[PDB]
């Protein structure tokens, strides 16, 4: 359980820095890695 | 012509339903990838796809919205336009300014389409049992439909044919500039983007149209799930709309062969002429 | 967006078959659905973008005692469309009871195309009034249709069934169909078999293949009604945008048809506008005056003179349209449709709200009144008794059609600010 | 241009720079690493080039590489990754592509270093992906024996749920890396080589193609912070495997 | 690496014969195994590099009461492959007992190709569900197959046997086959004879040579499933790499099939992606929603627009796929396969995990329930009694299929963090 929590938290931290890094290329990756918008409901 | 004069209607018939639910939210609640992606899906899905000169079609906004012509609380409802990008010898013809005039025409016409479909959505709600809201509904409908039709078959079609005639007779690039600036200037002037006060009566009339559609939709959904939460509101809206309608007819009557818009709008009439002149002595 | 069309009865299947054939002939397609090489326009209004670059029309076929359906089957226009929608009396009560038991499977046929469509805009009904097989069945299916989907529109293409004498149960059937036609339909385009027969005997000397030529007339009307939608226009490129302006009052929705050339086997704008205005080019036949008229023109037209044309038709002042609520005769202008050869270029179609149809309603009401008073022509069957033991559905339709004639006549009055 | 592309064949080297160095072939690359797993799981002080070149040869004769020209095949040969103590078995493997022709000027040693770097990152990722599908394989093999357990069902099911997020994260990145990092970049490079009418025009598109792929992945000076986040998902996968 | 394929039953032998013929037709080979002069690609996935430069397919033939086997024998595709693997009832119990006694010799046939192969990757099963001869025999051999080799994968190509009414013992047979299909198989690609028959009667007017055309459909699906393996691709060039992503839960392994052209006798990326997404191009027929979808495309495709296509299909937002942990619809792109003529270029195939197959499972469960309750349709034989005296294998399959329907339905719930 704690491993699961830890993993979800650090990947959320990855995504939040990911959003504004490059103009287009890295921005597109955010939409690739999340469709479900689980990290709008776990923000 | 297909987009700013909006000759392609099917594009907007699809686009507005799928877009305005996002546009309705206030400014900084929408981001440009969302509207751009919806436009791309709509454009390639719809029948406005014939040539690659539609991929310069983008979306932008108007912060200074109407004061520029000699606000911002919502974006998409008070700020919406299309941004085309030109080539180098087409920067010699159509500049930043000319594109902005195209956009300020198109924004006004966008509002004209918007209130129409707002009315149709209210229309299907009662598919009840009151003649007065039917008359107010039909009255606002007849007005705004006439306004649209006037613009489309007085300004849009014939002056587009005129510009197609002028450039056939161009002999140099100082003639094409005259034809272009005359075309744009005529189409802005005959339209209701005339009179440097911009006819505040028009803004206030469309304001009470928005109030009528919104409050009637809210009332009907509460009704489905009074004669003074129904009829008195219809009467008050009717008073303010009639007052501003007669203001509009008066301040258009001072204007002017271009008085044909007044003579078309009142064909037979009922209560659209109330007193010929009002004036106070000395 | 996307509109699903319906056809039922042999006459409705005939007019739908002719309509789909006539739009196949208009569009640059083969009778298989294959696009031609010289194609553009909007072809999603009734045509499914099918799986082999086929534009398959989206048409609901309903039939009972199939006679014409086999003739539709063995044709090269069954390769144009075949959505497998075929599913198997002459009374309204008999057709009503036959529609009663099998409503779920034909409703599955409905929901099949409903889920097959991404968007939905309206339902067009091809229904023959007092058509025998069509009557009763069409009324029941109309009732279920507006019951299921109140978020869409209904148009019904209707004929006025009387050949001026025959069948004595037909006013009862058309009356019950008219009750549902009022309260379960939102737009009715009414046609007259008498007026079309008179114009067919006028321009030509035919009176025996009247159905076949009337098919040509109604298909031209239906195509001209949809040309601004099927080709890139600007206004009323949806059905509801067209329907909205014409109706000031939700039971005043009966639409009158005329057409500027009468014989189809340079003129100016105000000319053909004036000729479309006259009642003798109107192909459907105290004061009677129009509420509001909408007109569409398609042909070779010089566009810059239309405002002077508008002034000239104004000061000609041909109709004293309405008291209360300012309506207008309202113009729309369209291009003549490409992708096919075009003879008789300048052609106009008018949609109008006129109270003169109350005369035809009073005609069939008087026919029903005398047949009810004589009481040897009801033709008492167990179907009619089991459907309604006291036959008070006729009474409900009678008070509703009385209310509608009252609505017509009080709308003709200068006061309709009070209701009636 | 003609004599350089026919007498010393510049283009065939590019096609084997994508397949081999950019690892874009896939058949060779998976079957090679598949045969290379038991060597790499053992520590790297007792691993030498003698065992590298021949298992490479068995992979080469099995896969599509065997048909190709002997020049490009000769120019692929093994190297040991920068030998340093620590017994990191999985880390010690590398390809050294030797260019010593006239075409060395278009394939200079400084941009081969970029090839080595992207090969390293796409060695790490394709290692971790195979670890992950071994976890997924352990699920489909073992768990039909653990249906006879009423108590381990909970914990094995919890692992099933947690695993698919790893699978998803290692398949969204790995389609961005597929279809935009080695499919769009390959195309635009292929255009800018196929038209190009100067030695300079080949070189100056080649360089920026490599740099653009560096920008697409997380190997910039600014995106080191994002790469650390990505390495933290490489922690958990070897944890869950145990 | 190397995959060994299996075929049993007359229907399975038909689909395998068509598959091997269709890949002979695709690849640049003769029907003798001789390579052609215009050949490259990877041809070791199912083809033994045989002794005369023959690419001999590695196929296990199993037959009982040989009828179609003689027709396979006298053909020029018996010179393509002949590994001498031929070894000679209509009940599941009868086929089970017949497989019981001769398991060792057919297992020697298995081990012959097992030792003949250097590497092993998986076993594909061509099995017809409730096929008479195939049923029971295939279940027994499936059980022995996963028993012997737990280090390999099993795929089983399955049909849903019901022609919507016939044979009353078929739900028992398909139920027992479904029990082994759950717990002794790791990936199941299920097909519907009803849906394929409906699409065959849709695009054409054939309903009598349905087996022959369904052979064409399944061979195209099986070839398109393996094109990334047979031609040089980059991902899922092994079977297990394909199987791994699709399965989040080891009993959720049922794979749904669709295909973007429906009739096979320029468009853009997001177009055919959207059309592959729709259920009416899906050729297999409360909420039901996809767990995860994988799709492969093969054709003439402009590769640079796929990301904007990806965005457009995202914001079109067609399916509300799953609650708990995040799957996706996942794209793979392939080249159209050379070495043969290619009509209908843009063709897509989709592999999806959808809970909608629980409806079909509940259909055959309800059929079994009514046939069990009536108790005149079990058709009591000594085979069924000697195999199971109390018939509790049906009870075990019944509780397992109940657990699977529960698994489907609780996976549809937002909570499957608790098991069920």
């Amino acid at each position: 359980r704690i491993l699961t929590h830890f993993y979800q938290g650090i990947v959320q931290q990855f995504l939040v820095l990911l959003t504004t890094s490059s103009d287009e290329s890295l921005r597109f990756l955010s939409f690739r890695l999340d469709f479900n918008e689980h990290y709008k409901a776990r923000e | 012509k297909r987009y700013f004069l909006m000759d392609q209607g099917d594009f907007f018939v699809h686009f507005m339903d799928l877009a305005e639910e996002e546009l309705r939210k206030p400014v900084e609640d929408i981001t440009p990838p969302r509207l751009e992606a919806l436009l791309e899906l709509a454009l390639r899905m719809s029948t406005a796809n014939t040539d690659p000169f539609k991929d310069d079609l983008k979306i932008d906004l108007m912060p200074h919205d109407l004061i520029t012509q000699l606000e911002l609380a919502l974006s998409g409802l008070e700020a919406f336009s299309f941004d085309y990008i030109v080539k180098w010898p087409l920067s010699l013809i159509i500049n930043r300014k000319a594109l902005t005039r195209y956009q300020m025409l198109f924004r006004h016409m966008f509002y004209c389409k918007h209130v129409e479909r707002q009315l149709c959505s209210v229309w299907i709600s009662n598919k009840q049992w009151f003649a007065g809201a039917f008359t107010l509904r039909q009255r606002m409908l007849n007005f705004v439909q006439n306004i649209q039709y006037y613009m489309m078959f007085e300004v849009m079609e014939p002056t587009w044919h005129i510009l197609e005639k002028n450039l056939k007779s161009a002999s140099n690039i100082d003639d094409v500039l005259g034809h272009h600036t005359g075309f744009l200037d005529t189409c802005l002037k005959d339209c209701m983007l005339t009179n440097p006060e911009l006819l505040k009566v028009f803004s206030k009339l469309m304001s009470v149209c928005v109030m009528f559609t919104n409050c009637m939709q809210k009332f009907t959904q509460s009704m489905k799930l009074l004669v003074s939460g129904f009829e008195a509101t219809i009467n008050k809206f009717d008073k303010n709309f009639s007052a501003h309608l007669l203001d509009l007819l008066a301040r258009l009557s001072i204007y002017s062969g271009m008085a044909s818009v007044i003579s078309r709008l009142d064909f037979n009439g009922f209560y659209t002429e109330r007193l010929e002149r009002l004036s106070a002595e000395r | 967006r996307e509109i699903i069309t319906l056809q039922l009865g042999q006459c409705g299947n005939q007019i739908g078959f002719e309509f789909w054939k006539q739009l196949c002939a208009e569009h640059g397609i083969s009778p298989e659905g294959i696009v031609e090489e010289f194609a553009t326009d909007r072809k999603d209004v009734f045509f499914y973008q099918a799986d082999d670059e086929h534009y398959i029309p989206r048409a609901v076929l309903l039939d009972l005692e199939p006679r014409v359906i086999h003739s539709i089957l063995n044709s090269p226009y069954a390769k144009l469309y075949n959505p497998e929608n075929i599913y198997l009396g002459n009374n309204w009560a008999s057709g009503f009871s036959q529609g009663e038991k099998i409503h779920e499977d034909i409703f599955d046929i409905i929901d099949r195309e409903a889920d097959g469509s991404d968007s939905l805009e309206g339902f067009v009904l091809c229904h023959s009034i007092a058509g025998g097989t069509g009557s009763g069945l069409g009324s029941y299916l109309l009732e279920r249709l507006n019951d299921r989907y109140p978020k869409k529109l209904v148009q019904t293409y209707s004929v006025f069934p009387n050949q001026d004498e025959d069948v004595v149960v037909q006013p009862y059937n058309s009356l019950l169909t008219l009750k549902r036609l009022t309260q379960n339909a939102d737009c009715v385009v009414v046609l007259d078999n008498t007026a079309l027969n008179r114009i067919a005997t006028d321009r030509l000397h035919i009176q025996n293949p009247s159905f076949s030529q009337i098919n040509q007339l109604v298909s031209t009307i239906m195509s001209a009604s949809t040309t601004t939608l099927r080709y890139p226009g600007y206004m009323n490129n949806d059905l509801i945008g067209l329907i909205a302006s014409l109706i000031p009052t939700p039971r005043l929705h009966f639409l009158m048809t005329g057409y500027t050339p009468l014989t189809t086997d340079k003129t100016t704008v105000l000319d053909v506008m004036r000729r479309l205005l006259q009642p003798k080019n109107v192909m459907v036949s105290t004061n009677h005056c129009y509420i509001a008229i909408l007109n569409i023109i398609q042909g070779e037209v010089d566009p810059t003179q239309v405002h002077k044309s508008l002034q000239r038709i104004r000061e000609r002042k041909l109709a004293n349209f309405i008291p209360w609520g300012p309506a207008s005769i309202q113009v729309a202008l369209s291009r003549k449709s490409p992708y096919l050869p075009s003879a008789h270029r300048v052609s106009g179609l008018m949609m109008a709200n006129h109270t003169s149809i109350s005369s035809l309603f009073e005609r069939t009401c008087r026919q029903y009144d005398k047949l009810r008073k004589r009481e040897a022509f009801l033709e008492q069957f167990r179907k009619e008794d089991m459907f309604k033991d006291n036959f008070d559905e006729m009474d409900t339709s009678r008070e509703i059609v009385q209310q509608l004639i009252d609505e017509y006549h009080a709308a003709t009055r200068p006061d309709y600010i009070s209701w009636g | 241009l003609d004599v350089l592309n026919k007498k010393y064949s510049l283009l065939d080297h590019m096609q084997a720079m994508r397949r081999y160095l950019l690892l874009g072939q896939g058949d060779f690359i998976r079957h090679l690493m598949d045969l290379l797993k038991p060597e790499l799981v053992r520590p790297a002080t007792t691993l030498y080039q003698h065992n590298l070149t021949g298992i490479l040869e068995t992979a080469v004769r099995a896969t599509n590489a065997q048909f190709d020209s002997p020049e490009i095949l000769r120019r692929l040969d093994v190297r040991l990754l920068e030998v340093s103590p620590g017994d990191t078995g999985w880390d010690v493997f590398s390809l050294d592509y030797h260019v010593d022709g006239p075409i060395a000027t278009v394939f200079t040693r400084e941009c081969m270093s970029h090839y080595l770097r992207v090969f390293n990152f796409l060695w790490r990722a394709k290692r971790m992906e195979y670890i992950l599908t071994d976890i997924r394989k352990g699920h489909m093999c073992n768990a039909k024996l653990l249906r006879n357990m009423p108590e381990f069902s909970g914990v094995l099911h919890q692992c099933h749920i947690l695993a698919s997020e790893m699978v998803h994260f290692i398949h969204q990145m790995q389609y961005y890396i597929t279809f935009e990092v080695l499919e769009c970049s390959w195309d635009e490079l292929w255009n800018k080589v196929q038209q190009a009418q100067d030695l300079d025009h080949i070189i100056a598109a080649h360089e920026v193609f490599l740099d653009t792929i560096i920008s697409r992945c997380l190997l910039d000076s600014d995106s080191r912070a994002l790469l650390n986040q990505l390495r933290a998902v490489f922690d958990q996968i070897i944890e869950l495997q145990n």
Side-chain angles (χ1 to χ4, degrees), chain A, chain B residues 1-278 280, chain C, chain D:
Chain A
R1 288 303 291 179
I2 300 306
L3 298 200
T4 299
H5 306 330
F6 211 59
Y7 159 67
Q8 296 276 270
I10 191 144
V11 72
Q12 195 263 317
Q13 184 44 241
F14 175 48
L15 297 163
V16 62
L17 190 62
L18 192 151
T19 51
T20 309
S21 317
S22 92
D23 310 334
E24 164 187 326
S25 46
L26 280 72
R27 170 180 57 90
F28 201 68
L29 270 157
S30 56
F31 323 129
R32 310 293 63 64
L33 270 57
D34 196 23
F35 280 58
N36 178 49
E37 302 313 287
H38 193 101
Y39 303 106
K40 183 56 74 170
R42 213 161 154 177
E43 213 164 275
Chain B
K1 185 262 295 178
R2 302 190 299 158
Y3 302 126
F4 291 93
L5 194 138
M6 306 172 66
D7 183 29
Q8 286 304 308
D10 309 302
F11 172 74
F12 299 108
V13 177
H14 279 186
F15 174 71
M16 290 300 295
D17 186 18
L18 267 63
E20 177 43 49
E21 62 207 6
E22 187 74 51
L23 297 175
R24 170 194 42 81
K25 302 163 186 175
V27 62
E28 290 296 311
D29 292 331
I30 302 107
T31 188
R34 169 63 83 169
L35 320 99
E36 185 60 56
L38 267 291
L39 191 145
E40 287 323 288
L41 170 82
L43 167 138
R44 296 292 291 283
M45 172 178 64
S46 173
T47 175
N49 174 9
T50 47
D51 65 343
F53 295 124
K54 61 186 191 307
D55 301 313
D56 302 349
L57 175 48
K58 310 295 178 168
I59 299 174
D60 62 305
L61 80 171
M62 291 272 163
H64 312 279
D65 58 7
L66 292 175
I67 299 171
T68 34
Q69 300 90 285
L70 303 188
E71 300 194 59
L72 181 56
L74 263 63
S75 54
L77 284 192
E78 310 168 25
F80 191 85
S81 58
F82 285 162
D83 169 49
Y84 182 88
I85 59 169
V86 307
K87 324 295 300 181
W88 283 263
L90 309 169
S91 50
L92 308 174
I93 305 311
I94 305 198
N95 58 4
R96 206 267 316 143
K97 301 191 177 70
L99 188 67
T100 318
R101 322 280 60 75
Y102 278 123
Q103 289 163 281
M104 293 192 163
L105 295 157
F106 165 69
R107 152 181 86 185
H108 189 252
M109 298 164 41
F110 188 91
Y111 303 143
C112 310
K113 310 321 184 286
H114 189 198
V115 291
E116 181 266 356
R117 50 175 75 75
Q118 291 326 285
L119 180 147
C120 311
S121 47
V122 170
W123 189 99
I124 198 50
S125 64
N126 57 4
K127 61 181 295 293
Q128 192 179 357
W129 295 308
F130 180 47
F134 306 158
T135 46
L136 185 52
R137 187 185 56 164
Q138 169 64 27
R139 182 168 281 178
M140 286 200 186
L141 177 49
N142 169 256
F143 178 79
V144 303
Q145 202 146 352
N146 285 2
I147 294 314
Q148 294 173 96
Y149 286 14
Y150 148 74
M151 299 195 180
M152 309 320 174
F153 303 120
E154 191 162 318
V155 183
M156 307 320 152
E157 188 68 87
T159 312
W160 164 247
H161 294 291
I162 289 169
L163 205 56
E164 289 172 290
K165 298 294 178 66
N166 300 347
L167 277 303
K168 192 64 173 57
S169 45
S171 70
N172 53 79
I173 287 85
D174 210 23
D175 300 349
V176 312
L177 288 169
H179 308 150
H180 183 285
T181 194
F183 167 79
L184 203 56
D185 197 44
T186 49
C187 300
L188 61 86
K189 181 167 75 177
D190 44 36
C191 181
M192 301 157 204
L193 278 301
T194 185
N195 187 62
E197 308 178 63
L198 277 298
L199 310 171
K200 296 173 168 72
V201 284
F202 200 82
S203 58
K204 293 175 177 287
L205 191 140
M206 305 302 280
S207 301
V208 302
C209 300
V210 170
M211 305 318 164
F212 166 72
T213 42
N214 176 65
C215 303
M216 284 331 103
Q217 192 52 254
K218 299 289 190 176
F219 167 71
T220 43
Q221 53 81 16
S222 49
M223 191 67 151
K224 264 73 175 186
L225 275 300
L226 299 177
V227 290
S228 77
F230 180 50
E231 170 200 59
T233 304
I234 294 300
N235 173 231
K236 170 173 54 182
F237 276 149
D238 179 34
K239 295 294 106 177
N240 293 358
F241 177 77
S242 281
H244 277 305
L245 167 73
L246 270 296
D247 291 354
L248 195 41
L249 280 160
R251 287 188 64 164
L252 189 49
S253 65
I254 62 169
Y255 199 54
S256 179
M258 52 183 75
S260 45
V261 54
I262 300 170
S263 61
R264 182 192 180 266
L265 176 65
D266 190 16
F267 198 90
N268 177 266
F270 177 84
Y271 292 176
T272 180
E273 194 61 60
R274 297 277 73 193
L275 186 43
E276 313 320 297
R277 180 155 303 180
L278 294 83
Chain C
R1 290 98 45 98
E2 321 169 41
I3 301 178
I4 301 305
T5 102
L6 280 100
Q7 52 180 351
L8 82 120
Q10 318 186 97
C11 304
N13 287 322
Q14 275 173 138
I15 65 182
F17 175 73
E18 222 14 271
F19 175 74
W20 293 130
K21 206 166 79 54
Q22 218 3 191
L23 263 67
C24 169
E26 192 241 270
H27 291 307
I29 75 178
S30 69
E32 302 78 65
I34 314 291
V35 301
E36 300 304 311
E37 58 286 345
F38 74 107
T40 84
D41 62 321
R42 160 100 190 201
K43 292 169 74 172
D44 209 19
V45 301
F46 313 99
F47 305 105
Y48 182 62
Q49 174 45 251
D51 313 272
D52 203 17
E53 231 2 272
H54 286 203
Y55 282 92
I56 287 189
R58 324 186 284 262
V60 186
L61 218 120
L62 285 131
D63 70 304
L64 242 289
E65 315 160 355
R67 202 283 287 281
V68 69
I69 309 299
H70 323 310
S71 59
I72 298 167
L73 259 143
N74 52 10
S75 39
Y77 322 104
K79 330 170 304 185
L80 197 60
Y81 51 101
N82 189 239
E84 290 291 327
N85 45 354
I86 305 168
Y87 196 92
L88 266 76
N90 300 326
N91 306 319
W92 193 96
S94 66
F96 211 81
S97 50
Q98 289 208 118
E100 206 84 72
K101 53 202 184 67
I102 60 177
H103 68 301
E104 290 300 302
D105 52 68
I106 59 194
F107 185 50
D108 226 68
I109 299 174
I110 294 162
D111 296 329
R112 178 204 79 187
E113 302 206 336
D115 306 327
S117 76
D118 196 2
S119 272
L120 191 61
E121 186 85 14
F123 294 88
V124 120
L125 192 58
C126 305
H127 186 213
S128 152
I129 306 303
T133 42
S135 49
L137 237 117
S139 66
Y140 177 77
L141 264 305
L142 169 74
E143 287 175 304
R144 309 289 73 71
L145 236 93
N146 70 290
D147 273 331
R148 292 289 322 120
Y149 311 109
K151 301 305 174 303
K152 312 301 163 176
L153 263 184
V154 266
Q155 211 183 32
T156 280
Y157 282 128
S158 325
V159 296
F160 175 74
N162 186 9
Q163 314 310 106
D164 311 342
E165 284 79 36
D166 197 344
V167 151
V168 301
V169 74
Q170 80 195 353
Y172 310 97
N173 305 323
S174 28
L175 108 30
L176 292 166
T177 325
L178 251 140
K179 177 243 174 194
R180 277 83 188 172
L181 211 140
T182 38
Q183 76 190 50
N184 307 132
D186 291 14
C187 173
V188 181
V189 188
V190 205
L191 288 85
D192 280 21
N193 308 124
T194 54
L196 289 226
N197 191 20
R198 282 155 199 157
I199 296 175
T201 50
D202 211 33
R203 60 188 287 268
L204 287 176
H205 305 317
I206 51 103
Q207 66 281 333
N208 321 102
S210 52
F211 295 111
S212 316
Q213 309 325 300
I214 276 174
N215 290 145
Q216 315 300 322
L217 307 185
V218 61
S219 25
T220 48
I221 293 159
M222 287 191 51
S223 70
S225 62
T226 63
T227 312
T228 180
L229 294 98
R230 299 173 290 107
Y231 280 92
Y234 199 10
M235 268 42 75
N236 305 332
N237 295 11
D238 55 350
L239 151 78
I240 133 203
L242 203 152
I243 301 310
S245 67
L246 289 174
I247 298 172
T249 300
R251 293 271 64 88
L252 294 168
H253 57 280
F254 291 80
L255 293 215
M256 318 286 272
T257 93
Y259 180 68
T260 330
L262 293 182
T263 318
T264 338
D265 289 335
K266 202 109 171 201
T267 137
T268 191
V269 186
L270 67 142
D271 272 5
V272 285
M273 293 202 0
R274 189 182 37 197
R275 318 265 37 75
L276 198 61
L277 218 141
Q278 83 201 34
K280 297 186 71 67
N281 296 350
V282 170
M283 323 204 287
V284 183
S285 311
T286 175
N287 197 226
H288 282 282
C289 51
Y290 292 89
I291 297 105
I293 305 183
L294 193 105
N295 56 91
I296 185 55
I297 193 58
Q298 49 268 0
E300 314 288 84
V301 35
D302 192 51
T304 157
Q305 335 182 87
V306 289
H307 44 91
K308 327 254 201 177
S309 157
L310 248 30
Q311 190 69 67
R312 286 189 202 147
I313 303 301
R314 179 182 185 261
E315 320 286 74
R316 186 46 196 92
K317 214 177 284 309
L318 297 142
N320 38 318
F321 280 75
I322 202 66
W324 52 272
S328 195
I329 180 176
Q330 298 181 358
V331 352
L333 160 127
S334 69
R335 287 87 53 87
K336 191 79 174 181
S337 94
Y339 312 140
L340 86 163
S342 196
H344 294 69
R345 299 299 184 95
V346 253
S347 260
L349 177 61
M350 40 150 295
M351 276 305 94
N353 223 336
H354 200 167
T355 72
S356 42
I357 196 53
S358 128
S359 59
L360 277 302
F361 294 149
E362 282 287 274
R363 279 187 48 182
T364 169
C365 282
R366 160 206 44 85
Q367 297 153 11
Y368 162 68
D369 283 359
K370 59 149 187 295
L371 290 194
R372 191 64 162 180
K373 283 160 197 311
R374 288 180 76 181
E375 194 64 29
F377 311 105
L378 177 61
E379 296 298 281
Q380 177 64 239
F381 293 141
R382 301 313 304 171
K383 304 307 168 163
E384 324 171 320
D385 196 16
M386 286 323 172
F387 165 71
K388 193 56 191 56
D389 294 295
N390 295 348
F391 313 102
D392 302 349
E393 288 288 273
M394 316 169 178
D395 222 353
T396 350
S397 108
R398 231 322 287 157
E399 57 179 328
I400 288 299
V401 70
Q402 196 42 66
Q403 281 183 63
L404 256 307
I405 299 310
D406 286 16
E407 272 184 65
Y408 277 133
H409 292 195
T412 340
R413 306 315 158 223
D415 274 38
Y416 200 68
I417 306 109
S418 142
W419 59 273
Chain D
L1 294 158
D2 277 347
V3 70
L4 263 293
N5 61 51
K6 294 157 182 66
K7 182 53 190 301
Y8 308 104
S9 185
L10 53 88
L11 189 147
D12 297 331
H13 286 42
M14 308 187 154
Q15 170 54 27
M17 272 178 192
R18 188 222 84 199
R19 273 179 42 147
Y20 297 152
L21 301 186
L22 297 190
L23 313 99
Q25 158 73 8
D27 296 331
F28 182 31
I29 302 304
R30 199 279 331 170
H31 192 26
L32 174 69
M33 290 180 65
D34 169 46
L35 296 181
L36 179 52
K37 277 190 187 196
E39 292 83 0
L40 291 183
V41 72
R42 306 187 280 101
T45 308
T46 73
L47 307 190
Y48 283 87
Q49 59 183 0
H50 305 69
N51 317 320
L52 288 194
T53 310
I55 66 183
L56 181 143
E57 195 177 25
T58 298
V60 163
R61 60 141 303 288
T63 197
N64 207 0
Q66 57 179 335
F67 304 108
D68 296 16
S69 90
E71 307 294 322
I72 58 168
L73 175 64
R74 180 198 39 86
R75 288 191 187 275
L76 182 141
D77 273 320
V78 297
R79 197 197 48 108
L80 297 91
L81 189 146
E82 297 291 324
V83 299
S84 308
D87 292 333
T88 178
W90 297 95
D91 286 20
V92 184
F93 186 86
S94 73
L95 302 179
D96 185 25
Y97 186 77
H98 47 271
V99 188
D100 307 301
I103 62 187
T105 304
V106 325
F107 295 143
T108 174
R109 295 300 204 188
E110 61 182 4
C111 54
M112 310 312 291
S113 62
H114 306 173
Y115 271 114
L116 267 294
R117 293 153 49 186
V118 302
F119 163 81
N120 178 49
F121 191 34
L122 272 71
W123 204 252
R124 265 176 294 164
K126 302 289 179 65
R127 164 152 80 245
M128 288 306 158
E129 201 176 47
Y130 300 172
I131 302 302
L132 168 142
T133 190
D134 212 338
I135 296 176
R136 179 50 58 187
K137 178 60 145 59
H139 288 138
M140 56 182 95
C141 297
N142 296 123
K144 58 186 197 286
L145 276 300
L146 298 99
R147 316 192 79 183
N148 302 94
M149 309 291 191
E151 71 272 13
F152 290 102
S153 45
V155 61
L156 62 87
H157 170 69
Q158 214 171 285
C159 306
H160 302 339
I161 302 300
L162 172 59
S164 299
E165 293 186 353
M166 301 293 177
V167 170
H168 167 90
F169 186 83
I170 303 306
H171 289 89
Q172 302 330 105
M173 286 285 314
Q174 282 55 37
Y175 298 169
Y176 180 74
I177 293 159
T178 308
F179 300 107
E180 282 175 71
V181 174
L182 58 90
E183 289 311 325
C184 310
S185 302
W186 172 251
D187 287 346
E188 57 177 341
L189 182 67
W190 183 258
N191 304 321
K192 298 178 298 200
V193 299
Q194 188 55 39
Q195 53 186 305
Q197 293 190 16
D198 198 6
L199 192 63
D200 208 355
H201 295 174
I202 300 285
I203 295 164
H206 171 275
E207 295 183 337
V208 60
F209 161 83
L210 274 57
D211 288 7
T212 300
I213 297 182
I214 297 303
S215 50
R216 294 173 185 271
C217 60
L218 283 190
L219 315 175
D220 312 305
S221 157
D222 303 342
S223 77
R224 281 186 293 159
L226 285 300
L227 183 54
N228 302 321
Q229 305 301 106
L230 192 142
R231 294 301 325 268
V233 91
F234 287 0
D235 309 355
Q236 306 285 280
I237 181 169
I238 193 64
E239 167 57 50
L240 265 55
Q241 168 62 55
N242 311 323

